Amino acid sequence: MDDEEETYRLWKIRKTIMQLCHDRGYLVTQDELDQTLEEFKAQSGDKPSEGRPRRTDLTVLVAHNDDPTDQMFVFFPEEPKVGIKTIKVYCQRMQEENITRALIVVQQGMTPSAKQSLVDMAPKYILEQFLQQELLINITEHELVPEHVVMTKEEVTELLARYKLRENQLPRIQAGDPVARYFGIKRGQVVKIIRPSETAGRYITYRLVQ
Amino acid sequence: NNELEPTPGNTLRQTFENQVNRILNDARDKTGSSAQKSLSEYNNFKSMVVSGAKGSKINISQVIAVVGQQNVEGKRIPFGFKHRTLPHFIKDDYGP
Amino acid sequence: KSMESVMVKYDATVRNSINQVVQLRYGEDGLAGESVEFQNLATLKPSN
Amino acid sequence: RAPSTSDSVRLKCREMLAAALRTGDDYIAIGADEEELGSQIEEAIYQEIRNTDMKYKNRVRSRISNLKDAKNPNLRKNVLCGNIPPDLFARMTAEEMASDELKEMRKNLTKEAIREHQMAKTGGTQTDLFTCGKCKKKNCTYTQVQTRSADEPMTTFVVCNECGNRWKFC
Amino acid sequence: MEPDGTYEPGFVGIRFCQECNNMLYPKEDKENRILLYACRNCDYQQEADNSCIYVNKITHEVDELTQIIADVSQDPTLPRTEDHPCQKCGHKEAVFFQSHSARAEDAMRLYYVCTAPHCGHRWTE
Amino acid sequence: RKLRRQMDIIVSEVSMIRDIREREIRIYTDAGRICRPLLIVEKQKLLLK
Amino acid sequence: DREVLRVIFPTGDSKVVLPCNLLRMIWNAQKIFHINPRLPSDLHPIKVVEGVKELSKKLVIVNGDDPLSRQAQENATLLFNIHLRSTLCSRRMAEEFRLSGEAFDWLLGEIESKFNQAIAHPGEMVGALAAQSLGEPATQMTLNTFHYAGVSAKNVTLGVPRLKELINISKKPKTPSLTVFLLGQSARDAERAKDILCRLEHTTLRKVTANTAIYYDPNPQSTVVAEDQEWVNVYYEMPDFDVARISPWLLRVELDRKHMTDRKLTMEQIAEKINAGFGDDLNCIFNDDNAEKLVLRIRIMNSDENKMQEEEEVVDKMDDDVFLRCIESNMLTDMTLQGIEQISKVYMHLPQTDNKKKIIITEDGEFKALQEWILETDGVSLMRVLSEKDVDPVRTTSNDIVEIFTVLGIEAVRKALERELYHVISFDGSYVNYRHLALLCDTMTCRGHLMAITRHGVNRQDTGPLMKCSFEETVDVLMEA
Amino acid sequence: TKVVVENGELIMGILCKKSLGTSAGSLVHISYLEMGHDITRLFYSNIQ
Amino acid sequence: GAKKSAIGQRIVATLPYIKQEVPIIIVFRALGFVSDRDILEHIIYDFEDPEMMEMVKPSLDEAFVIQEQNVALNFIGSRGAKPGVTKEKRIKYAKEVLQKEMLPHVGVSDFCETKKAYFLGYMVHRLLLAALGRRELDDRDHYGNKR
Ligand SMILES: [Zn+2]
Ligand SMILES: [Zn+2]
Ligand SMILES: [Zn+2]
């Protein structure tokens, strides 16, 4: 345990998040998408010695939707339970980098003030929080998962316009959903849910985030 | 004799109870199938069963040949009479 | 007591007593179930 | 090739290993010295661990158990004659050594019995009477249901396991 | 030291205190380096007869061959066998059965008790 | 039982049961117990004439 | 369409309920028009093509002024249009159906007319219809005996009690279950599947122990347990400097080699487990598996110094004898050597030749069945089960809808409840319309919240005051209103 | 042993219930579709 | 937790009118049989089986917190109610319950207390066999066990 297999987890979670970022539209390199565990150890020169800062090594920037806002950032805290101290240093790093988005992946628990500070952060800036064990398996790989697409405000505008649909009338979607957390979807935003239909052949629905 | 081989993933008793059940089912089915053959097409009963009315072959088995095993929740009748069902039976009896 | 709250609407969309949308259309086609029938598509034919 | 080490504990393990190879005179008949073989085994454990780990000591200990066996002297002898090199003997690949005479047999049959524990699972059925038009094979199952029901006639339902087909007596 | 021996040390379940018939309790004499047995309510104490003072996880033996007086043999509803010669007395009428308990014994194997006077023996084949 | 059979013991009331398994003999003469008449078989034969 | 259709139906069953039986309609034209195989089949194929293209336009269910509505139009009609396109092929008309253009032309008018007919009435109280549509099959033999064998344990207790519980949305199923699929070789290798079986399966320490005993041992090496005496005595590389003060009392446990056969275990795994849990404070030693019996004898790490009545604190920090029992009480009951801590023990084996699943495509384009090893388990740690190696996270499911919400969310819930209701329905064998089941899942999920649609959740609902008061509470909703 | 009717004329086949109704592929369902409830009800009363 | 690692061997009698349950062995102290040997005979005439001995042993550990019959009676009484500090009354009440309210069916006479004690041990013994598993579980559906 924590001797070799751990690298596989760190590899698989790295690919899962990269695919997630890739799914977010960020131009992850195919090789990063394609790399093997053997290559993953090779890419990081992994395991010259034990308990090495792989989580510091795993820490990465990801960047590229086709809309060049650029610069999303992913950080992996070394401490299982993350404190405000690491959050301030992180806050300093994201500020100094002036990144647009920061994703922090915590191993275990957190102080509620850090949890609070993460929630509020800044009215004009976003910080993202992901638990490592939940990342350990890509839920979107599951067969029961429909295709989810975030809708542009104009698409939402067009959607309401075409139907004369009232905002209330739209089914709500709870932001407590892991998948909601996956898209990084915000409240009030709409996600396009694409489903197979045993009747239509194809069924599309939408839900506003609550 | 304890020379009986238990079914993998099951106890010997589970095998034994299962094994006796296949036999009581195969025989009844065989003897039933004999009765399905034994009846003329002239019969009202076969006429009633074939037409899709309220009847079947199992009925024929029950009326003509054999009702079959009675069970409790699918299990053979429990030994409510102290390792027996009735005082007419010998102790440790396992007859159907 | 649960299902009494829902009915079909004239815009084909399925809605409740407070007019909120359940479905884009009833059964995702808006057609009557009685007019449906068992059929073989047979396009899943073995050999291409 | 005697491998000398500077660590007293390693030498002490080597002495303990040399002592384990002293079992039952086989080293005499083979003519190989227990101390050199004992020294080569410990070095080999060390070549992998490179530290006086308890687990490193544990390998000596697992090695001790294999040396101190009396039911497989031919194991020691296979090692002594160089057929099982000390670097090989140390250097794993035997799965709790017990080759020659019985524990291996036991190990095989144990592998059989635990393999048998999936075999059937817990049930059976099958009738093999009705043909299935999707696969010609009569791999079918049959249902006895609708004891009374409503106006629908009691039917015998037949399902084909493979390729999933189900149809009725009617 | 061989895989052919057995472990029947004859555990000592209890010894009553001669002062009160209460149970004696283990204790060390760290000064004499010896195990002792004492009662709590009184000052009565005595040395131990063995180093073993405890046993656990129990019931991997043939209980059903025990705890069965042959007097069951008087029950007519228990079937005699035509199988002869009590394991002792050269006479048949052995009474037979499974274990027939909580340890219902997946062992459906017959166990034999002769009913012939002057033996009382409980065996199986 | 012979006293029971002699009617010097009330068969209609007195129940008498022995369990070798428990090494016990239980007897009950309380009200509300159900009993029924049976033919008494002796030497695998009926006692009646 | 044929290529697309393989995606839509992994079961490979092409027999589906659909509107307008064109075959019977086409056949009727033949019965009417008197077309026969010994008569020529005069046809214009482009007219067929256009007729299908035009009829496709006639398939209006929404406006076609914008492409999205058309996309809405296109996908909603997609499956029917494929049945239509597959059936109305030019070759089919001329060869199989031998239809004349006139026969084809009259038929088109008929099909459209059938299409106009298929439309349901707007304003319909279909919901009351659906409630009755669920209620009626519930009346049948949903509770009639556990007829199911299927080479396995009788899981997901059949029918109404699960249906009642489901309606009640109990936090946990009365009978939780989970189906373990196996990727690659595990599907074909029992030995690999057993290796997974060993890894997944719950194992308590009490499950592992053959016997335990407590001994008074004057010397750790000159032990009174003479059988183990060389075994202790031979060890010397162990720091026996701090053992000159460790518990003079000996505690020894006997281990079930049968269990070691049973779960495929080793001594080194056990010793390392015990020390990691109890810490350095517990001394642990054991004989080799090749011995006469597996025994493990333990000591408390009395670290020489202050652990010797240093402060006399009149409390007796811990007596030895009792402490061997507290550890042993704790040793058996607390430690799980292997497995998920709520899955009981958890496996049953089934051969995939069980059902129509894992039907796979081939070079020919024909569907074929794939056989496999599978375990059906009682358990719901969906994160942990998803996290397990070699198990397929895609197909692996559990009977607990709650975990689906918690992990995958309400959208996956909508599907799993849908599958499960259908599954109860599939057991009774009485067909029920699917659209209703699709509709039912939408009703419970329309809020995006998992909650009892019953009276147990009405107060959270935004429903009207007269509704909530109608739920027998009356005055309480009305006073607040 | 097999059922077949053409132009309202029965060629062969002993009848069953799956033919006679409350099932898929039944004469009753298609008559309802073609002949409609009114013609089908009069046929049904008549046959009985 | 770390208290005694083995609470699951504590039976715990349910006495009439008492506000809570108390160990069977406490009653035995109230019966005045302070000697464990005497209680064991009351439990079984044949303690030669170590298995029966080990199963009862954890109840014996309970017995030592109170040895005196008088304290035991006041204890049971204290569990019965709170007649102030007057622990004559709790004892006296316990005495009345022990005679009349406990197993009336054998007799409420004082000298039939020792006699009463003999029934309880078989009752526990019968429980003990079934709890050990040597006894089969009694049927509720059986009519012979019914009136
Ligand atoms: Zn088939
Ligand atoms: Zn004493
Ligand atoms: Zn004899």
UniProtKB/Swiss-Prot annotation, chain A:
UniProt-listed Pfam families: RNA_pol_Rpb5_C (PF01191), RNA_pol_Rpb5_N (PF03871)
MF terms in GO: DNA binding; DNA-directed RNA polymerase activity
Any single Gene Ontology cellular-component annotation: cytosol
Keywords: Acetylation, DNA-directed RNA polymerase, Host-virus interaction, Isopeptide bond, Nucleus, Transcription, Ubl conjugation
Stretch forming the signal peptide: none
Disulfide cross-links: none
InterPro entries the UniProt entry points to: Arch_Rpo5/euc_Rpb5 (IPR014381), RNA_pol_Rpb5_N (IPR005571), RNA_pol_Rpb5_N_sf (IPR036710), RNA_pol_subH/Rpb5_C (IPR000783), RNA_pol_subH/Rpb5_CS (IPR020608), RPB5-like_sf (IPR035913)
Residues in cross-link Glycyl lysine isopeptide (Lys-Gly) (interchain with G-Cter in SUMO2): K81
Compartments, as annotated in UniProt: Nucleus; Nucleus, Nucleolus
Biological process terms in GO annotation: protein stabilization; transcription by RNA polymerase II; transcription elongation by RNA polymerase I; tRNA transcription by RNA polymerase III
N-acetylmethionine PTM positions: M1
SUPFAM superfamilies assigned to the protein according to its UniProt record, in alphabetical order: Eukaryotic RPB5 N-terminal domain (SSF53036), RPB5-like RNA polymerase subunit (SSF55287)
Domain of life: Eukaryota
Presence of the UniProt keyword Nucleus in the record: yes
Location, primary (coarse class): nucleus
Family assignment from sequence similarity: Belongs to the archaeal Rpo5/eukaryotic RPB5 RNA polymerase subunit family.
Protein name: DNA-directed RNA polymerases I, II, and III subunit RPABC1
Record organism: Homo sapiens (Human)
Swiss-Prot record, chain B:
Annotated domain remarks: The C-terminal domain (CTD) serves as a platform for assembly of factors that regulate transcription initiation, elongation, termination and mRNA processing. The trigger loop allows entry of NTPs into the active site, switching between an open and closed state with each NTP addition cycle.
Quaternary organization: Component of the RNA polymerase II (Pol II) core complex consisting of 12 subunits: a ten-subunit catalytic core composed of POLR2A/RPB1, POLR2B/RPB2, POLR2C/RPB3, POLR2I/RPB9, POLR2J/RPB11, POLR2E/RPABC1, POLR2F/RPABC2, POLR2H/RPABC3, POLR2K/RPABC4 and POLR2L/RPABC5 and a mobile stalk composed of two subunits POLR2D/RPB4 and POLR2G/RPB7, protruding from the core and functioning primarily in transcription initiation. Part of Pol II(G) complex, in which Pol II core associates with an additional subunit POLR2M; unlike conventional Pol II, Pol II(G) functions as a transcriptional repressor. (Microbial infection) Interacts with herpes simplex virus 1 protein ICP22; this interaction causes loss of CTD 'Ser-2' phosphorylation from Pol II engaged in transcription.
Organism: Homo sapiens (Human)
This protein's name: DNA-directed RNA polymerase II subunit RPB1
Compartments in which it is found: Nucleus; Cytoplasm; Chromosome
Protein family: Belongs to the RNA polymerase beta' chain family.
Signal peptide start-end: none
Effect ascribed to mutating M48T: In NEDHIB; uncertain significance; severe
UniProtKB/Swiss-Prot annotation, chain E:
Domain of life of the native organism: Eukaryota
Subcellular location: Nucleus, Nucleolus
Ligand binding (Zn(2+) 2): C86, C89, C114, C119
Name of the protein in question: DNA-directed RNA polymerase II subunit RPB9
Zn finger (C4-type) location: 17-42
Major localisation: nucleus
Residues recorded as bearing N-acetylmethionine in the entry: M1
SMART domains for the chain: RPOL9 (SM00661), ZnF_C2C2 (SM00440)
Quaternary structure note: Component of the RNA polymerase II (Pol II) core complex consisting of 12 subunits: a ten-subunit catalytic core composed of POLR2A/RPB1, POLR2B/RPB2, POLR2C/RPB3, POLR2I/RPB9, POLR2J/RPB11, POLR2E/RPABC1, POLR2F/RPABC2, POLR2H/RPABC3, POLR2K/RPABC4 and POLR2L/RPABC5 and a mobile stalk composed of two subunits POLR2D/RPB4 and POLR2G/RPB7, protruding from the core and functioning primarily in transcription initiation. Part of Pol II(G) complex, in which Pol II core associates with an additional subunit POLR2M; unlike conventional Pol II, Pol II(G) functions as a transcriptional repressor.
Pfam families xrefs: Zn_ribbon_RPB9, Zn_ribbon_TFIIS
Segments passing through the bilayer: none
Binding sites annotated in the UniProt record for Zn(2+) 1: C17, C20, C39, C42
GO BP field: maintenance of transcriptional fidelity during transcription elongation by RNA polymerase II; transcription by RNA polymerase II; transcription initiation at RNA polymerase II promoter; transcription-coupled nucleotide-excision repair
Protein family according to the UniProt entry: Belongs to the archaeal RpoM/eukaryotic RPA12/RPB9/RPC11 RNA polymerase family.
Keyword GTP-binding: no
GO cellular component: nucleolus; nucleoplasm; nucleus; RNA polymerase II, core complex
From Swiss-Prot, chain H:
Record text on subunit structure and interactions: Component of the RNA polymerase II (Pol II) core complex consisting of 12 subunits: a ten-subunit catalytic core composed of POLR2A/RPB1, POLR2B/RPB2, POLR2C/RPB3, POLR2I/RPB9, POLR2J/RPB11, POLR2E/RPABC1, POLR2F/RPABC2, POLR2H/RPABC3, POLR2K/RPABC4 and POLR2L/RPABC5 and a mobile stalk composed of two subunits POLR2D/RPB4 and POLR2G/RPB7, protruding from the core and functioning primarily in transcription initiation. Part of Pol II(G) complex, in which Pol II core associates with an additional subunit POLR2M; unlike conventional Pol II, Pol II(G) functions as a transcriptional repressor.
Similarity comment: Belongs to the RNA polymerase beta' chain family.
Signal sequence, renumbered to the chain: none
UniProt gene name: POLR2A
Lineage start: Eukaryota, Metazoa, Chordata, Craniata, Vertebrata
Domain notes: The C-terminal domain (CTD) serves as a platform for assembly of factors that regulate transcription initiation, elongation, termination and mRNA processing. The trigger loop allows entry of NTPs into the active site, switching between an open and closed state with each NTP addition cycle.
The protein's name: DNA-directed RNA polymerase II subunit RPB1
Intracellular or extracellular location(s): Nucleus; Cytoplasm; Chromosome
